[PDB]
Ligand binder design. Sequence first.
Ligand code: HEM
Length: 383
Amino acid sequence: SPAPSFPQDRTCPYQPPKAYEERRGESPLTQVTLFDGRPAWLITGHAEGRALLVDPRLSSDWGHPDFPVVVAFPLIGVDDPVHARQRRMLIPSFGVKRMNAIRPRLQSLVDRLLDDMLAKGPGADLVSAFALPVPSVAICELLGVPYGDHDFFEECSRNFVEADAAFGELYTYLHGLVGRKQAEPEDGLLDELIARQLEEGDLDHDEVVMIALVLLVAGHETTVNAIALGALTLIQHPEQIDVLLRDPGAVSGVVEELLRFTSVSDHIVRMAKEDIEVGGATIKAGDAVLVSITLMNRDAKAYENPDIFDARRNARHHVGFGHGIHQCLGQNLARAELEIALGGLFARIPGLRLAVPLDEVPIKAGHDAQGPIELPVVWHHHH
Ligand code: HEM
């Protein structure tokens, strides 16, 4: 593409910009241009994207001098062998048993947020009143943050999602927490990771803090958007709100279709390490490769009528959580947050509606995780 063309902003909060669907060819990948003129491949085919995302030839090394920027981090910003070591230290903390202990806390939090919303009502900004606190507290419970420090932690987290004093405040708190936990172990991912490091066996104090900070950054804003834009999508599709009021398996199916349709992480970034033949093209070593989660999830070859939101469709292999080497580690926590927050919101406020026309909802730009900056809602009944 001769002039910078990626990214482009959404105009509809839960549809990709026209220019992205126009950029899609018959081919499963096309080409765009980043802000400084760098060419990049855009992967749009659902099947080819999955194939490429398990492929070791695509790097995520953010420390490489030529790593693409669209305009430093454990896990998400490294290749093997650092990647596999950090991730295998974490996997056992995201187990079924830890999730299920997190569930009733998210339940109790969601009820409280809803009582409070209703006490102040109507309406509310659903981002501020509801989507914003949930991922915060989920991360506190995940990490094992002393319950005494939750308000502080949420507050920091909220200030973050300029703002690089929030991020530094979290660093310094976490740095101290890590030290306190090493000398007096408690319960939580921090403790587990500390014990896992020590196993091996010198503790890397800054790496533990950075991993904790990556978990927070990766898991906070995207989940906030997935809650808020998920609610927006349902408000705009009131003929399907009932699916949320049926059994837990229907709730989980709504959650999967929202992940696919809304594609809150819209693209992820890679760099080729070697030549790759894909889809009639030859990606060369050093080439920027953007993987479009949005256009993959709207690929008609994978999903019949892909631009329709259908809460009952089979959405099993969506890439809303990515795929392969770096696919979302916190995905089962996020699913829990979404099921409990969306199911609780519509159970309590099934007539929840927008207080503003759709086209007045402010939404994030194209380089960002996708979703509303604010979400003015009102209701005139609640259960
Ligand atoms: C609905 C909410 C979420 C969405 C849509 C989402 C989406 C994604 C996507 C698309 C990736 C792939 C990144 C890549 O391939 O470059 C990813 C990775 C990651 N996510 Fe999530 N995520 C969510 C929530 C969370 C939560 C709650 C956590 C933490 C508890 C988390 C932690 C991570 C981590 C650590 C990675 C990197 C894993 C690795 O590099 O091996 N995410 N996420």
